[PDB]
Amino acid sequence: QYPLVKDLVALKETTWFNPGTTSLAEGLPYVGLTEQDVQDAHARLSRFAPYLAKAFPETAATGGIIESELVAIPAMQKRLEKEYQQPISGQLLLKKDSHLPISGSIKARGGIYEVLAHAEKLALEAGLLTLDDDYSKLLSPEFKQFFSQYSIAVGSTGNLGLSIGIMSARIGFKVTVHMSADARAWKKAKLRSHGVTVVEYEQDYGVAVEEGRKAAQSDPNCFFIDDENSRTLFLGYSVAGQRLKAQFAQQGRIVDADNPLFVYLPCGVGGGPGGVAFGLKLAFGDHVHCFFAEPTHSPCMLLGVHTGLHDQISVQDIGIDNLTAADGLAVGRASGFVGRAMERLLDGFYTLSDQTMYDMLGWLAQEEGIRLEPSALAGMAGPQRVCASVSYQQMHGFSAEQLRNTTHLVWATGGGMVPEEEMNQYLAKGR
């Protein structure tokens, strides 16, 4: 076998288990954020819940908590064991962030949160709002006019654009989304139907984000959503940790030393999976084990963490084209901060090809009736990478029994809003 980086260079599916993981206590100083920060995010989303229930009536029945289902997928589990000839110990579950309301992706967590935090900040500073107000008052025509004086910009592939576009437009902000090549036509149409300005290019994610950042700095009433650097996005994602813990409790599922939880997180820039992993660590401690999953054509986070260069190296530095069917994950350079903040708290990083993603996407639809976009399948290959590795199991001291009592949680990150035509194209690609 090649050394790891040569696998990367060759676009071979590969797996790196992190030999420098630490206890939660030993890792926490390096995060730069705390459980108090995470609880402040929960509290902010709770303050906005009465606004959201009215602004987006699809959330009224939970109102307006933005949360997704946690489901068991034992038919898919058996299918994976059949197709890849590797047993999956324990139970396989799926977290359906693909089916979050409003924008149908994990970006409905961090993207939406960042937009709400920005509105709140402006409204507070204007003297228009206090923390103990009923936030549904923000729906008033006066508030919409207030927010119309401010603009938001974002670069995206873009579930992020979709999330920040739809939320910002509903609030009353002017919003422009700078879209990478190609970004799906349906997403641009969807944004334009919400009164969002979209600016189309023909370079990748990093260029779109760069040009979007440039345009927002030209105006003190324009706020750039910076997915490479925003801790606010990260915190919006991290809210998922306690939400999941509460679901596990409700469902009567134990997470402890004897019943470990392994979580498999698709990774673009790292804010999404990093933020979720942080919230998970605070919720479950040393008993949750987190794995990032990237396309073979975009292994930016694995590359950054493995080499210790983080955002100082890109996939293109190693001759990789950053072209993948997994749009949400087609990020060529890791986060400005997530790798350093989180490496001690991440058990491993792996890559999988577009074809693997497409094959699994079809199997999931066949076995479970759940239809996702290719990006959302990246975690699905994780349980078998982990179960096959004797060295990973020995590294962490996992017994046969602990492995039988493991929960494997695949984090689905997008797909619920993909139109039938595009979904049928996805299904046509798998074998």
The encoded tokens of residue 342 equal 């989180």
174 or 190: CB nearest ligand PLP: 190
Q: How far is the CB of 404 from ligand PLP (least distance, A)?
A: 30
**Is residue 414 within the footprint of ligand PLP (CB under 6 A)?**
yes
Q: Token pair for residue 69?
A: 């289902």
DSSP label at 406?
P
Question: How many binding residues for K ion (CB under 5 A)?
Answer: 7
**Whole-angstrom distance, CA of residue 158 vs CA of residue 301:** 19
What is the DSSP annotation of 97-132?
Answer: GGG-TTTSBTHHHHHHHHHHHHHHHHHHHTTS--TT
238 forms part of the interface with ligand PLP (CB under 6 A): no
Is residue 90 close enough to count as binding ligand PLP by CB under 6 A? no
* Dist. CA 90–CA 340, nearest whole Å: 31
Any contact of residue 279 with ligand PLP (CB under 6 A)? no
331 touches K ion by CB under 5 A: yes
Own/partner contacts of 184-190, CB < 8 Å, gap of 24 or more, are 184/327, 184/422, 186/418, 186/419, 186/421, 186/422, 187/158, 187/159, 187/161, 187/162, 190/162, 190/166, 190/417
Q: Taking CB under 6 A as the rule, does residue 333 contact ligand PLP? A: no
Q: Could you give the angle at the alpha carbon of 104 between the alpha carbons of 77 and 118, nearest 5°?
A: 130
138/166 with CB nearer ligand PLP: 166
Closest CA to 33 of 430, 293, 341, 406: 341
Q: Which of 97, 120, 227, 294 binds K ion (CB under 5 A)?
A: 294
* Nearest distance from C-beta of residue 230 to ligand PLP, angstroms: 10
CB under 6 A: which stretch of 143-151, 182-190, 327-335, 349-357 binds ligand PLP?
327-335
Q: Contacts with ligand PLP in 106-135 (CB under 6 A)?
A: 106-107
- 274, 232 Cβ separation under 8 angstroms: no
Least distance from ligand PLP to the Cβ atom of residue 57, Å: 24
In the complex, residue closest to ligand PLP by CB: 268
Q: Which is nearer to K ion, 196 or 329 (CB)?
A: 329
Q: Quick count: other Cβ atoms within 10 Å of Cβ 347?
A: 19
Q: Which two tokens stand for residue 420?
A: 């039938």
At its nearest, how many Å lie between ligand PLP and the CB of residue 168? Answer: 17
- Cα–Cα distance, 277 to 357 (Å, whole number): 22
Angle between helix 35-55 and helix 240-251 axes, rounded to 10 deg: 80
Q: Which of 220, 350, 361 is nearest to 295 (CA)?
A: 350
Q: Kindly state the smallest distance separating residue 402's Cβ from ligand PLP, in Å.
A: 29
Partner touching 413 among K ion, ligand PLP, none, CB below 5 to 8 Å by kind: ligand PLP
String of contacts with ligand PLP for each residue 344-383, x by CB under 6 A: -----------------------------x-xx-------
Binding K ion (rule: CB under 5 A), the pick from 77, 89, 176, 298 is 298
**Should residue 268 be labelled a site residue for ligand PLP when binding is judged by CB under 6 A?**
yes
Interface stretch with ligand PLP, choices 36-44, 207-215, 264-272, 390-398 (CB under 6 A): 264-272
Query: Could you say whether residue 112 binds K ion (CB under 5 A)?
Result: no
- Choose between 104 and 271: whose C-beta lies nearer to K ion: 271
Listed residue (169, 180, 167) closest to 212, CA to CA: 180
- For 395, the 3-state DSSP assignment is helix
Q: Which is nearer to K ion, 164 or 267 (CB)?
A: 267
CB 115 within 8 A of CB 232: no
Please identify, among the stretches 168-176, 241-249, 269-277, 311-319, the one whose residues bind ligand PLP according to the rule CB under 6 A.
269-277
Is 104 a binder of ligand PLP (CB under 6 A)? no
- Print the SS3 string covering 127-170: CCCCCCCCHHHHHCHHHHHHHHCCEEEEEECCHHHHHHHHHHHH
CB of residue 321 to K ion, shortest distance in Å: 13
Residues in contact with ligand PLP by CB under 6 A are: 105-107, 159, 266-273, 328-329, 331, 373, 375-376, 413-414
Residues in contact with K ion by CB under 5 A are: 267-268, 294, 298, 300, 329, 331
